[PDB]
protein (DNA polymerase beta (E.C.2.7.7.7))
Amino acid sequence: ETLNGGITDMLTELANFEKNVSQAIHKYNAYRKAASVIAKYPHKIKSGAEAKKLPGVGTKIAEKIDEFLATGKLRKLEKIRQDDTSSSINFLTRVSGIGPSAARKFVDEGIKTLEDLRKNEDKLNHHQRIGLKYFGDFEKRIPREEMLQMQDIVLNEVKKVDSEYIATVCGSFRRGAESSGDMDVLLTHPSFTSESTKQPKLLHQVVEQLQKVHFITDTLSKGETKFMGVCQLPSKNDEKEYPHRRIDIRLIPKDQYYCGVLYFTGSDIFNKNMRAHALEKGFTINEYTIRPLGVTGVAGEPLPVDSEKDIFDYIQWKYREPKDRSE
DNA sequence: CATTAGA
DNA sequence: TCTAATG
Ligand code: NA
Ligand code: NA
């Protein structure tokens, strides 16, 4: 956690560079299992060989550990951190819609900068176009203060369209967070569940509403279950407009909401830990269900859930308010 | 790990 | 169809 720091950090830098700049899934994959284990290791690694005794660590990485331990740096690291090509990939990548694949390509073509991106708006697809358009705003954190505003709006219309609609804003905003990155809304409806062959309009109806009134201003992607877009708060009485924020809505079979809701609310840890608990408690928990465990090794049988409570109950835990779903 | 664009 | 990018 801190005794192993630089090492895992150096090691993570390396991985990340392979995967992105190079097309080396493997090396990239090496660095991480490595960085995975060395971080688990309970003692101050004092040398290559020491590390080396580890699983997944070999000569490659050891050698790296020495140099790093020896001098507070790394050449390959100083070299990469320096390299424009590689620098470029890292950056181009920030653009929502641009991954590494594209980033490489853009680069090979000579698109390095934000501006170059503009001059060639044409090479970019719709997504990347919006991404490039809202680049600044995309990078800005969302104030809970605004979070509250947005949430207020979406609930309102939802209800308006159909009253049988259940929506929840999941994420850290759900967990009390002072700010959020983007907004996640989970949605379901009673008439849509595990079997009942869809009702795509169900999603659509609401997207429509939202735009109707001008909350949604762009659409990154719309499918019959998951809409991915851009939203914005009504720029009040002039002098101050809101930044364009990312928003995602997802339709869910009413019969899988809470787990899902459980799950998205997190935190990543609270999940795992809770998840790890249900195991002893004779169960299994995933993004959509909760199955009583059978002895034969495994087992099915989706238990019926009507609230976050049904879940907690099942594993005989304490209902944890989201506030404290911190871990 | 699942969904959507795209070509 | 496959392959990319988001979550
Ligand atoms: Na080894
Ligand atoms: Na990106």
Summary: Residues 125-127, 220-223, 225-226, 228, 250, 287 of chain A lie near DNA strand B (CB under 10 Å from a C1'). Residues A 93-96, 98 surround sodium ion (ligand 2) (CB under 6 Å). The first strand of chain A starts at residue 142 and ends at 143.
